[PDB]
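Why do we bother with holo predictions? Because pocket geometry can differ from the apo form. Keep that in mind while you read this record for IUS.
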Amino acid sequence: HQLLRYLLDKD
Amino acid sequence: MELTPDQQTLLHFIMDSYNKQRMPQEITNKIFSAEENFLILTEMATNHVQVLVEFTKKLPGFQTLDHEDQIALLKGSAVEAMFLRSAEIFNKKLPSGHSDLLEARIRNSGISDEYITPMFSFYKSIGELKMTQEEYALLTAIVILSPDRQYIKDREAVEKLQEPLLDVLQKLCKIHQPENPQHFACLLGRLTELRTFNHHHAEMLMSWRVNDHKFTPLLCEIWDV
Ligand SMILES: CC(C)(O)c1ccc(-c2cccc(N(C[C@]34CC[C@](c5noc(C(C)(C)F)n5)(CC3)CC4)C(=O)[C@H]3C[C@](O)(C(F)(F)F)C3)c2)cc1
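The structure, written out:
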């Protein structure tokens, strides 16, 4: 789940 | 009895997170042709999911959760958080004589009556409660921080985060509606109706892929389609 983690981890 | 200073900071934090997540006042008023309709719906849904992630991220204690549990909560609450946020707009941001136009427009499009009828029944049902924007923001955070979702390893950790939000909401219900002492019970009662949308949405999704409609990579990821 690439996009979802990106949205969760980004600053 | 009243909200303590800590509860007011917690409420104000959530409200700031909830307001920083807002869809256009251009897309709201404008809300078209037949094939362009299926494109607007795919943008609307993506926008809900983008706003839901941004909001969740900022919820107190969420970043302290196991990475897999965070994904499970997001995946498990997306539909319910989306129907709740649309109810907030439909009853509070948009007037009575405007919601009706949106109902007709969505019906005359592709989407099933099996999907539309419960959707607007929920909007009318939750609209009767005359909920404040603080009530919508807390109920959204409560829906997201549900310990009973599929794949939740640490359930008690999720319950620890949800409990203080339920406390603030219970106090806000008395302070704003002391005439109806059941206002809080009515809000929780509306979550049972909100949980049915998981089944309805899943049906709508199987019809979407066979009617050859496009899905964005984000929608595929959050709903496994
Ligand atoms: C025809 C026509 C002009 O195109 C139009 C007119 C009115 C509407 C309309 C009517 C009532 C509620 C809403 N919803 C709820 C849903 C409604 C459908 C929904 C969705 N369908 O397929 C998907 C996929 C499968 C792509 F994942 N998801 C899921 C929830 C996307 C958004 C909002 O969230 C809107 C109401 C809102 O508050 C605003 F309109 F006021 F902005 C935001 C939209 C739609 C289209």
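Residues 2 and 175 of chain B are 7 Å apart (CA to CA).
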